[model samples]
Target chain A: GAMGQTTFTELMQQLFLKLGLNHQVNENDVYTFEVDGHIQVLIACYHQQWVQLFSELGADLPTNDNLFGEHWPAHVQGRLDGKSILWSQQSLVGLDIDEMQAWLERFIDDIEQRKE
Target chain B: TTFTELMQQLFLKLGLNHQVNENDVYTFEVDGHIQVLIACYHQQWVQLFSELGADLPTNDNLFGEHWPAHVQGRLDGKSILWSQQSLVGLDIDEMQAWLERFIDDIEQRKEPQNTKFQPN
Candidate 1:
């Protein structure tokens, strides 16, 4: 349980850094992140991107319904090359520490894997 | 003109979080007149002031002759703020009102002129 809690907090920090956002872990199960740009992934959570890769393979997977208590948003500016990213948190998932940690690791991996 | 129409035009042009939302009145006006919807977010006081300062046009001074009297109210992370239209095309009476409101709002918020912007 102790390791789970620590891992979860660490994962939250990692997620914020990778996404270029800032967050604060507060009392009462509140995880708040300061955001400045739009994370397409969050939108995908709600709108369920038609991943043809998975769909064509006929692999039906569970979706991330971001209809939860909070969401994060950002504003990326400038021309394509000089663009700056600004983001803010919009929703909080309220997941237990361990579960949130697990989810965060998965999320980070998803983004990292994409870059590869 | 309404904030909504103004914002619809702005959003289309500048993209999201680019339009101004200085207060409920401005928000309501934009929605009512322009049919645009703008959401104001809370931000650090220093951050908000710097943003306001940044939005000021460089070629024209606020108290100069080409003012059109633009006013927008916004809610920052912890404060309520407003920005007046340029003083370029504003008439004498309008200019006076704008100054009064600006002074009054600043005073009410108790923001010190000595407040320094946070380092980026």
Candidate 2:
């Protein structure tokens, strides 16, 4: 029932260190990490119960209506906000560094493949 | 309109049977594949969830290429989960439109064998 804001931020920092990624805690307490100077992963603690992770997947992709039947990798789900592909993940307050790292790795890999 | 009354009318219009659980959550089925759950939060927002029938692709490499654009979801065991949240003050017409779209999207995603092949 306790909030893990500080712990979550620390875990994210540690995860970024292990992955060799540069991360910054924004003024709003959101944890953001830049990938290859292009992609960014934003993590926020919501209402002390949910930790949400968001990443931008660029524009020029298919519309939401067209992607309804498309397949997605496990644990990765998304929605479109206008021209942006907002990928999000939500979990309880107890953040897991390993799981977060895995998701980041998978997301980065997906973005790389899409650029080709 | 209160979420209960709004959802009740919507359910009636959609011809779907729904029950308000002990926790005040509304549980209903849209077709046989998707189980829809609605939960009202502090009279400020409504959470909508659709539990899918099968697992989505697991390799992140294939996610964006296949996942639906407006659907936010994750896999749990063999089933995939999708959800959205709307303001409590959302217009009734807009709520109906959202529900209709949600059902239609699910229907459209049914396996090929479940749907007759239609030419473009």
Candidate 3:
């Protein structure tokens, strides 16, 4: 249980690197990266920790902040506008399944095209 | 079940007029407006509907009826919709819920024939 946060963050960092996002750890222990035009910050932790962070951080941000909301069909649509928010690294990891990845790649391609 | 029988029981009841293609995909028409390509493989029906979206569920319930919660939380904000070819691995109850909801939206859309607007 104590190792859960480290486990999640480490997994996400690997995933980010895989997706070609250049990642680094900040002095504050937050992980940062950029995908396409979006700069992403990820912290590895349990759901409660994320929720608490959102409550505090989200209060000063726009309601439409796109974190932990990435990769899900709706979240991608909502948050792909270069804004910062929590996206589910777990979901992206789960979707590494072949069929899921095909669908996801197609979805991402479409979104990228839409941006153009 | 035969295609015609399935059509009568499902698509027709849902008020979607359709055509069976040479490839046997049933292209369902939304009140002469938009069309969704559908087919069955391994007993699971599938379709490629519109692009995904940010639209919430509306009370109008038109064909292509966008459910706010389903579209918002479940769909993730794109307007394109594609049905997976197999609903396997999902609980039977959950699969049925998805199918039933799709049918209901189809029926609601068919109820209003004159308001048809085709997507470009």
Candidate 4:
């Protein structure tokens, strides 16, 4: 049996509750969760089959060439989409709340590093 | 590293058994359903192409319809062109996860057909 959008959305809300964060779901099925006051992470769900997590860096950062050159880090893959340097992850319907939280924390750290 | 070599490494890491065709395009299959193509562009950017077995609706926006906002593609007749780019600094783990999730979604999309007539 496939999962419903409401079930998955509620799962995400519960996960956020465990982290002491409040999340809002829009009509488009996108879930927005605020981190620290300024940063907001967006998660979009598709038919309860796929989930994508995104954290938008408010400003444009370096290009892929410069970042992937000699000094690139092993596990960091930052893609530039317009003004936002987004850190994203795509996963199956089974949500890993702890892993998602870790990725968000790392994304927040990356944004701070780029800002400085 | 060249895009070709980088993709080759990724294919190996993912244990994908792939073949290089006449146009120098890397072709592979996943779950016996989806076919994937990888083409190198000037060793700078890598373009990935796949067909998801159905025609995309022209009326709805593909980006708006999908989960990951970066995914952009259009329909070519009865097929949907699912294409994306891999820039120079793409993280291997991230790329792997993307590929895995993509394949998993397609697989799930096919499951209903397989179970439609099964005894419940």
Cα-based lDDT for every prediction: 0.29, 0.56, 0.38, 0.54
lDDT tens readout by residue for model 2, A1-116? 34366666677678878878666787887888777788777777665444556667676454332122232222333444543444544443334687667756776776665544
Measured against the true two-chain complex, the DockQ scores of the candidates, in the order shown, are 0.01, 0.05, 0.05, 0.04
The fraction of correct interface contacts reproduced by each prediction comes to 0.00, 0.00, 0.00, 0.03
lDDT of 3 by residue, B9-79 (tens): 56645565557777777666554544555565545333334322334232211112222112222235433
Query: In candidate 3, what fraction of native interface contacts survive?
Result: 0.00
lDDT leader = 2
Best-matching candidate per TM-score: 2
Q: What local lDDT score does residue B7 receive in model 4, on the 0 to 100 scale? A: 68
Q: Rank the candidates by lDDT, best first.
A: 2, 4, 3, 1
What local lDDT does model 2 show for residue A36? 72
In model 1, where do residues sit more than 4 Å from their true spots? A1-95, B1-120
Residue range A1-116, candidate 1, lDDT tens digits: 45545544555565566656565544533455322232223211111110000001112222212111121121111111222211112112233345344544444344333323
* Clash numbers, per candidate: 40, 6, 22, 1
lDDT of 4 by residue, A6-71 (tens): 656666776678778777878887888776787777777665645555665666555322122121
Please give the ranking of all candidate structures by TM-score, highest first, separated by commas: 2, 4, 3, 1
Per-candidate TM equals 0.19, 0.46, 0.35, 0.44
Better of 2 and 3 by lDDT: 2
Native contact fraction (fnat) of model 1: 0.00
